[PDB]
């Protein structure tokens, strides 16, 4: 169905398919013709000469279905490798859906969407490989059991099991429907086990540090019991499906009783051998069980790949296209640009038409919490949606090829999202192309005895707590400055990094980058006097509105806000 | 084996066990006695009177094994519910292993250890339920097929299939061994898929904000291909196991050829009916396939519950026991206490014997990054290991019942670990017992127009980005102060929370808590003049050593460090 758009994937796939199918074909050859042993065997009194070739053949056929063992295995390996590689493909590509998602909403929720990957993934693997393989094995045996019976034995007897097979068919049909539905929406509901995992992330150290130890327990209570009884729900749904196929195997098998009874009532036939055919009948219902269980388990397979295609696709929006911006610095000017993240809530910026040149490194100012941060995601184009619009350098903000554009600017956030790392990465990361640890060594050392860890330089291969845990804030803070010591891009901007820092390496890095980078606009906020005197221009934009700008020295008298800023401290 | 310590879990379990077992017993009754239909059926020429009761019975037996359908289902539901509830139990309890782990090492790594839960969990469920249930169904049919053959038919024929069954036994034995081993260490190796998920967490927004878009791809390259070819590795290992049981079903089934041949060579018997018994032989090898696949899949089951018991247990260390500390404030004094997190690296604190009373709220000072933070985890007893030792109030730090002890102090970290939240939690969380939103309303409002979000108070039910994303830093910072507006405990301490804050609500909360809490020692660091004048005592402890303390006013001349601190800014 949708399975038909599963179908395009690739051709060598088709090869493994044919491999397994013909394999089962050769499961069937000696199960049916197995009956073509027992069949003439049993009737003829074996005589001796008949007993001769008879007693001879089991050696042969036994070599034959043990052969069917190895062949079966072959096809198993091949198709398995096929299936696996398919999973591989999806996992990456739809990871290109999730990275393909990115930030604007992908802000909202994180690790629920995460576990989509791992645990909307693995069980779909198992269901795919296991389920599919076990399904295939079945119906060749069943089918052949029918056909051999039908024409290869008897025609009104054909009418018999072909009374079964259409009706049987519609049975698998309705089962496939009701159940593909129910357990489909099930795994939809189990994505809330992914919720569970997500929240139990959010445990981490926090409750531990308040001493709230029993609310966790409550958390796994509400969701865990719900989802676990949920599992039992669909297990009972499964063993409910096994009857509905069994009750049609009860009416179907029962119709073999009619087959058992009706010629028995009036036999135009010789029972004789064809009695043997009934053995197949027994064998026929033997795989029955598996299917239900299988299908249930396998139903999973169709289902999340389903939701991954469907629910997984959207929004890597675009770029009009260009080059990179050269390191030649543009000028940052916007027109009537304002936004707020939520909804009907009015834009957090009141409104603004940006203007600055580059080479003017201006002190940005506003009382915090103000969406003062927004310009970043704005200017970094985290948000394309623009009330008012931007052509920077006579060409619009969104005409600029994505990374190449973003190769205009780097930044330090209000805070740090970092890795477990040695010197290896979050310094050397920014663009790994230069990892040179001469160049990295002293390049980070351009944060000037951030090279110094405490009375030490770290065993430079020693990895860190992901956000830095293993020591107090300063050094990692300085790292968060250090990522910008490397990549240079036609404009750079930094903010609020100084949190626990000393004033020393702070200011020395101020003038240091000044010297280094004069001619980019470098924009920043401070609660300290640090840049607010020395930034070659000053601007105070508070909340979503600019109160003032120009040279701060004008603004100590011109307003009281900056005055008191200094005047207090 | 270890399965024998799986065994203690509970009794109603035993009930469901008996349920399923006797169930399969009644699968078997009419498969064997099914042969006890075909058997006398086929030989006797049916006559009519023989044909009468014969053609009669299929109605009966067909009602009987369709009965076996419903019975089978019953036992399925019951045992399933059993298995599920067992999983539930573990998931919580060993979550009490992981919380049972806590911080000291549990610092080191987070979300790899995480996915242990979800994806060392779910597949173990599937393997448990599915695998176990499918296993049980098998050997009752096999066994009975043997026994009915052995004594219920023929004794030297007993010798036949009991030539099989011991040898067959040792076959399942070696399979169980080699494979329990190999796929056991496999899932050990797949816990590195949990690694994968963990790192792809660490993608989140960071690379996105640098523009490093192709290193991710590399990350799923190295691990993803490895683990996926790893899956194929154990799939091929499985379909390698199916032969080794098939080659002993090739030698075993082949020994049925001997059974087929040897009496055929010289028959002391009447073949006749007992020819029919061979049908069972065919049916016998029919379940064969499943086991291998099953066992492989099921092997998973033993395995992580294995590693969960084993690898999951340790360290909720202890408490000597006491009451809570009363809100009556102790005095914080240590003896020769110093530590550093890493290894052979010498303690980050040089050494210290703490002393302060409570009611003295002292300005703690040191250049940051210095392990200045450590005292927290120290004093909060995140680290029991103490070079030098502590009896605070003549009774040791570790004599104090855990939370109750920690009910002496609350704190704001150097940073924020928070939730998606409305007003609902991270303010109201601290101890949910008072969520009172009068009391919460103005209790958080004790952060004084932190009540104010921007020109607004949030729709007070509006949840936030987990770390607060939806607006700039200030308000959530103030929240991180607000968690301490509620819980009071015989001492409180706060640090570095003011990061983007204004000075206004900062200082007003300073004196506000002063007024409110005088008589606890309240200890803090600042890069601002804020508390450094007004903290009723002053201490500068830099790096792992105390340089100075007393009244700062003594220390502006007495050292230059504080002087310049002010004197610069």
mmCIF file of N, CA and C in Angstrom, chain B residues 194-257:
data_model
loop_
_atom_site.group_PDB
_atom_site.id
_atom_site.type_symbol
_atom_site.label_atom_id
_atom_site.label_comp_id
_atom_site.label_asym_id
_atom_site.label_seq_id
_atom_site.Cartn_x
_atom_site.Cartn_y
_atom_site.Cartn_z
ATOM 1 N N UNK B 194 23.342 2.302 22.024
ATOM 2 C CA UNK B 194 22.966 3.287 23.020
ATOM 3 C C UNK B 194 23.963 4.422 23.007
ATOM 4 N N UNK B 195 25.255 4.104 22.856
ATOM 5 C CA UNK B 195 26.188 5.202 22.636
ATOM 6 C C UNK B 195 25.672 6.069 21.508
ATOM 7 N N UNK B 196 25.410 5.452 20.349
ATOM 8 C CA UNK B 196 25.004 6.225 19.180
ATOM 9 C C UNK B 196 23.903 7.201 19.532
ATOM 10 N N UNK B 197 22.813 6.693 20.099
ATOM 11 C CA UNK B 197 21.711 7.566 20.464
ATOM 12 C C UNK B 197 22.202 8.691 21.357
ATOM 13 N N UNK B 198 23.005 8.351 22.356
ATOM 14 C CA UNK B 198 23.549 9.362 23.248
ATOM 15 C C UNK B 198 24.253 10.485 22.481
ATOM 16 N N UNK B 199 25.162 10.132 21.585
ATOM 17 C CA UNK B 199 25.883 11.206 20.928
ATOM 18 C C UNK B 199 24.946 12.011 20.051
ATOM 19 N N UNK B 200 24.049 11.335 19.346
ATOM 20 C CA UNK B 200 23.155 12.095 18.494
ATOM 21 C C UNK B 200 22.217 12.960 19.315
ATOM 22 N N UNK B 201 22.053 12.659 20.602
ATOM 23 C CA UNK B 201 21.562 13.707 21.479
ATOM 24 C C UNK B 201 22.495 14.864 21.295
ATOM 25 N N UNK B 202 23.762 14.625 21.635
ATOM 26 C CA UNK B 202 24.662 15.754 21.825
ATOM 27 C C UNK B 202 24.737 16.613 20.582
ATOM 28 N N UNK B 203 24.158 16.148 19.481
ATOM 29 C CA UNK B 203 23.968 17.070 18.391
ATOM 30 C C UNK B 203 23.088 18.240 18.787
ATOM 31 N N UNK B 204 21.820 17.990 19.122
ATOM 32 C CA UNK B 204 20.907 19.066 19.499
ATOM 33 C C UNK B 204 21.117 20.307 18.633
ATOM 34 N N UNK B 205 21.359 21.465 19.241
ATOM 35 C CA UNK B 205 21.535 22.658 18.425
ATOM 36 C C UNK B 205 22.973 23.082 18.162
ATOM 37 N N UNK B 206 23.956 22.447 18.789
ATOM 38 C CA UNK B 206 25.284 23.061 18.830
ATOM 39 C C UNK B 206 25.987 23.115 17.476
ATOM 40 N N UNK B 207 26.207 21.960 16.853
ATOM 41 C CA UNK B 207 26.792 21.999 15.527
ATOM 42 C C UNK B 207 25.966 22.882 14.638
ATOM 43 N N UNK B 208 24.651 22.762 14.745
ATOM 44 C CA UNK B 208 23.765 23.603 13.968
ATOM 45 C C UNK B 208 24.125 25.066 14.134
ATOM 46 N N UNK B 209 24.566 25.463 15.327
ATOM 47 C CA UNK B 209 24.820 26.886 15.511
ATOM 48 C C UNK B 209 26.238 27.248 15.081
ATOM 49 N N UNK B 210 27.141 26.275 14.961
ATOM 50 C CA UNK B 210 28.395 26.640 14.307
ATOM 51 C C UNK B 210 28.301 26.581 12.791
ATOM 52 N N UNK B 211 27.482 25.687 12.244
ATOM 53 C CA UNK B 211 27.552 25.320 10.838
ATOM 54 C C UNK B 211 28.548 24.236 10.452
ATOM 55 N N UNK B 212 28.592 23.158 11.240
ATOM 56 C CA UNK B 212 29.469 22.002 11.076
ATOM 57 C C UNK B 212 28.827 20.766 10.460
ATOM 58 N N UNK B 213 27.841 20.985 9.601
ATOM 59 C CA UNK B 213 26.796 20.024 9.273
ATOM 60 C C UNK B 213 27.224 18.621 8.833
ATOM 61 N N UNK B 214 28.480 18.406 8.434
ATOM 62 C CA UNK B 214 28.848 17.102 7.874
ATOM 63 C C UNK B 214 29.608 16.211 8.852
ATOM 64 N N UNK B 215 29.897 16.703 10.055
ATOM 65 C CA UNK B 215 30.603 15.840 11.000
ATOM 66 C C UNK B 215 29.642 14.857 11.662
ATOM 67 N N UNK B 216 28.402 15.283 11.903
ATOM 68 C CA UNK B 216 27.330 14.373 12.287
ATOM 69 C C UNK B 216 27.354 13.151 11.406
ATOM 70 N N UNK B 217 27.162 13.387 10.114
ATOM 71 C CA UNK B 217 27.166 12.326 9.131
ATOM 72 C C UNK B 217 28.300 11.366 9.406
ATOM 73 N N UNK B 218 29.480 11.909 9.681
ATOM 74 C CA UNK B 218 30.619 11.077 10.029
ATOM 75 C C UNK B 218 30.337 10.267 11.285
ATOM 76 N N UNK B 219 29.656 10.882 12.247
ATOM 77 C CA UNK B 219 29.421 10.200 13.506
ATOM 78 C C UNK B 219 28.544 8.984 13.296
ATOM 79 N N UNK B 220 27.465 9.142 12.542
ATOM 80 C CA UNK B 220 26.642 7.967 12.310
ATOM 81 C C UNK B 220 27.365 7.026 11.378
ATOM 82 N N UNK B 221 28.333 7.540 10.633
ATOM 83 C CA UNK B 221 29.123 6.652 9.803
ATOM 84 C C UNK B 221 29.818 5.637 10.685
ATOM 85 N N UNK B 222 30.797 6.111 11.449
ATOM 86 C CA UNK B 222 31.653 5.215 12.210
ATOM 87 C C UNK B 222 30.861 4.212 13.031
ATOM 88 N N UNK B 223 29.966 4.702 13.879
ATOM 89 C CA UNK B 223 29.252 3.805 14.771
ATOM 90 C C UNK B 223 28.146 3.096 14.013
ATOM 91 N N UNK B 224 27.394 3.826 13.195
ATOM 92 C CA UNK B 224 26.183 3.237 12.648
ATOM 93 C C UNK B 224 26.521 2.060 11.757
ATOM 94 N N UNK B 225 27.464 2.236 10.836
ATOM 95 C CA UNK B 225 27.825 1.114 9.981
ATOM 96 C C UNK B 225 28.371 -0.034 10.800
ATOM 97 N N UNK B 226 29.296 0.260 11.708
ATOM 98 C CA UNK B 226 29.811 -0.767 12.597
ATOM 99 C C UNK B 226 28.691 -1.568 13.249
ATOM 100 N N UNK B 227 27.701 -0.893 13.823
ATOM 101 C CA UNK B 227 26.700 -1.612 14.596
ATOM 102 C C UNK B 227 25.726 -2.327 13.682
ATOM 103 N N UNK B 228 25.573 -1.829 12.466
ATOM 104 C CA UNK B 228 24.576 -2.399 11.577
ATOM 105 C C UNK B 228 25.114 -3.634 10.884
ATOM 106 N N UNK B 229 26.336 -3.540 10.382
ATOM 107 C CA UNK B 229 27.070 -4.744 10.042
ATOM 108 C C UNK B 229 27.205 -5.645 11.258
ATOM 109 N N UNK B 230 27.178 -5.066 12.453
ATOM 110 C CA UNK B 230 27.209 -5.881 13.658
ATOM 111 C C UNK B 230 25.948 -6.722 13.763
ATOM 112 N N UNK B 231 24.795 -6.086 13.568
ATOM 113 C CA UNK B 231 23.557 -6.830 13.491
ATOM 114 C C UNK B 231 23.631 -7.947 12.474
ATOM 115 N N UNK B 232 24.075 -7.627 11.256
ATOM 116 C CA UNK B 232 24.204 -8.668 10.241
ATOM 117 C C UNK B 232 25.139 -9.773 10.708
ATOM 118 N N UNK B 233 26.185 -9.401 11.439
ATOM 119 C CA UNK B 233 27.100 -10.376 12.013
ATOM 120 C C UNK B 233 26.348 -11.404 12.833
ATOM 121 N N UNK B 234 25.483 -10.942 13.727
ATOM 122 C CA UNK B 234 24.815 -11.920 14.573
ATOM 123 C C UNK B 234 23.638 -12.579 13.876
ATOM 124 N N UNK B 235 23.142 -11.975 12.799
ATOM 125 C CA UNK B 235 22.134 -12.667 12.005
ATOM 126 C C UNK B 235 22.767 -13.848 11.287
ATOM 127 N N UNK B 236 23.943 -13.624 10.701
ATOM 128 C CA UNK B 236 24.670 -14.732 10.101
ATOM 129 C C UNK B 236 25.054 -15.754 11.153
ATOM 130 N N UNK B 237 25.419 -15.301 12.353
ATOM 131 C CA UNK B 237 25.674 -16.242 13.439
ATOM 132 C C UNK B 237 24.442 -17.090 13.725
ATOM 133 N N UNK B 238 23.261 -16.480 13.661
ATOM 134 C CA UNK B 238 22.029 -17.228 13.875
ATOM 135 C C UNK B 238 21.843 -18.291 12.808
ATOM 136 N N UNK B 239 21.786 -17.871 11.549
ATOM 137 C CA UNK B 239 21.575 -18.829 10.471
ATOM 138 C C UNK B 239 22.773 -19.762 10.315
ATOM 139 N N UNK B 240 23.832 -19.535 11.100
ATOM 140 C CA UNK B 240 24.872 -20.545 11.309
ATOM 141 C C UNK B 240 24.439 -21.534 12.384
ATOM 142 N N UNK B 241 23.705 -21.052 13.385
ATOM 143 C CA UNK B 241 23.196 -21.967 14.398
ATOM 144 C C UNK B 241 22.115 -22.872 13.840
ATOM 145 N N UNK B 242 21.302 -22.366 12.924
ATOM 146 C CA UNK B 242 20.218 -23.198 12.393
ATOM 147 C C UNK B 242 20.751 -24.459 11.723
ATOM 148 N N UNK B 243 21.879 -24.434 11.005
ATOM 149 C CA UNK B 243 22.493 -25.687 10.547
ATOM 150 C C UNK B 243 22.950 -26.588 11.669
ATOM 151 N N UNK B 244 23.684 -26.059 12.649
ATOM 152 C CA UNK B 244 24.304 -26.923 13.643
ATOM 153 C C UNK B 244 23.226 -27.708 14.378
ATOM 154 N N UNK B 245 22.046 -27.109 14.541
ATOM 155 C CA UNK B 245 20.888 -27.876 14.978
ATOM 156 C C UNK B 245 20.290 -28.641 13.810
ATOM 157 N N UNK B 246 20.310 -28.073 12.614
ATOM 158 C CA UNK B 246 19.844 -28.865 11.497
ATOM 159 C C UNK B 246 20.789 -30.000 11.166
ATOM 160 N N UNK B 247 22.101 -29.795 11.240
ATOM 161 C CA UNK B 247 22.998 -30.907 10.965
ATOM 162 C C UNK B 247 22.873 -31.978 12.031
ATOM 163 N N UNK B 248 22.396 -31.609 13.213
ATOM 164 C CA UNK B 248 22.026 -32.634 14.171
ATOM 165 C C UNK B 248 20.558 -32.994 14.008
ATOM 166 N N UNK B 249 19.813 -32.186 13.259
ATOM 167 C CA UNK B 249 18.549 -32.673 12.732
ATOM 168 C C UNK B 249 18.767 -33.349 11.395
ATOM 169 N N UNK B 250 19.936 -33.144 10.797
ATOM 170 C CA UNK B 250 20.290 -33.907 9.611
ATOM 171 C C UNK B 250 20.803 -35.279 10.007
ATOM 172 N N UNK B 251 21.591 -35.331 11.077
ATOM 173 C CA UNK B 251 21.997 -36.608 11.641
ATOM 174 C C UNK B 251 20.860 -37.217 12.448
ATOM 175 N N UNK B 252 19.993 -36.370 13.006
ATOM 176 C CA UNK B 252 18.875 -36.857 13.805
ATOM 177 C C UNK B 252 17.751 -37.361 12.916
ATOM 178 N N UNK B 253 17.162 -36.463 12.137
ATOM 179 C CA UNK B 253 16.280 -36.861 11.055
ATOM 180 C C UNK B 253 16.879 -38.002 10.248
ATOM 181 N N UNK B 254 18.157 -37.885 9.882
ATOM 182 C CA UNK B 254 18.859 -38.992 9.244
ATOM 183 C C UNK B 254 18.753 -40.268 10.071
ATOM 184 N N UNK B 255 18.782 -40.146 11.398
ATOM 185 C CA UNK B 255 18.608 -41.332 12.227
ATOM 186 C C UNK B 255 17.164 -41.809 12.199
ATOM 187 N N UNK B 256 16.256 -40.969 11.707
ATOM 188 C CA UNK B 256 14.908 -41.440 11.425
ATOM 189 C C UNK B 256 14.879 -42.189 10.099
ATOM 190 N N UNK B 257 15.717 -41.773 9.149
ATOM 191 C CA UNK B 257 15.996 -42.646 8.016
ATOM 192 C C UNK B 257 16.478 -44.017 8.464
#
